[PDB]
Amino acid sequence: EVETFAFQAEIAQLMSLIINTFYSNKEIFLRELISNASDALDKIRYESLTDPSKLDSGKELHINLIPNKQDRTLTIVDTGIGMTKADLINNLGTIAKSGTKAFMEALQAGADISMIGQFGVGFYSAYLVAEKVTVITKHNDDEQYAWESSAGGSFTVRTDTGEPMGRGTKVILHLKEDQTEYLEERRIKEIVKKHSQFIGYPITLFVEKE
Fold first, then answer.
1. Which domains does the chain have, with CATH numbers?
2. Numbered residues of the known binding site for ATP
3. Span of the secretion signal?
4. How many angstroms separate the CA atoms of 173 and 131, rounded?
5. Contact between residue 140 and residue 45 where contact means Cβ atoms under 8 Å apart
6. What is the three-state SS of the chain?
7. How far is residue 35's CA from residue 20's CA, in Å, rounded to a whole number?
8. Which residues share a beta bridge with 68?
9. Whole-angstrom Cα distance, residue 128 to residue 15?
10. Residue positions in the annotated binding site?
């Protein structure tokens, strides 16, 4: 049972701009997704301070980076607060309509695409390197869901009968054929060291069987 939704026009515009604008500095997608992961982990930590039972779904607060050259996927996993079905439908828990307006105004005042995170819409920088993005999520107050989009103005939501997550969010980047450098250990390590050196959660870069 798969539900198909239209993006709000402003979010479709943001996605088209990210996909179609000539912009060489694509590596910032990983900073943005690690920042989002950190923000999600902060939220469940904060809830846990007054209700320890919030971590019954998993005590470990971490970020895993999982490259898979066979599947041409880079997966960013966090054990943060996760998203409800309503959060997924509401632009992955963002105020993306107003964030897109502010970002496009900034792009007219000399800003560049790397500043996307300042506008609360850094998730969509995934489309710098991904032809398709799959988001698997589990919030304490809801079931596990899969969101997906190849852009083209639409996204799907379904209940995920896949591997149970406990709590958090998995962002699965189905990389463009010319963006496979982001599956290379040395490249991922370089980007995490350059842009994510002060993130307050363990970031584990998984290795592959050669």
1. 3-205 (3.30.565.10)
2. 36, 78, 97, 123
3. none
4. 8
5. no
6. CCEEEECCHHHHHHHHHHHHCCCCCCCHHHHHHHHHHHHHHHHHHHHHHHCHHHHCCCCCCCEEEEEECCCCEEEEEECCCCCCHHHHHCCCCCCHHHHHHHHHHHHHCCCCHHHHHHHCCHHHHHHHCEEEEEEEEECCCCCCEEEEECCCCEEEEEECCCCCCCCEEEEEEEECHHHHHHHCHHHHHHHHHHHCCCCCCCEEECCCCC
7. 24
8. 73
9. 9
10. 36, 78, 97, 123
Beta pairing class for 154-159 and 145-149: antiparallel
What is the radius of gyration, based on Cα positions, of the chain?
A: 16
Resolution given for this structure, in angstroms? 1.5
Retrieve residue 79's tokens: 């054990």
Give yes or no for a contact between 131 and 150, defined as CB atoms under 8 angstroms apart: yes
The residue to which tokens 């370089």 are assigned: 190
Q: Scanning the structure block, which residue is given the tokens 């701009």?
A: 17
Q: What are phi and psi of 64, to 5 degrees?
A: -115, 135
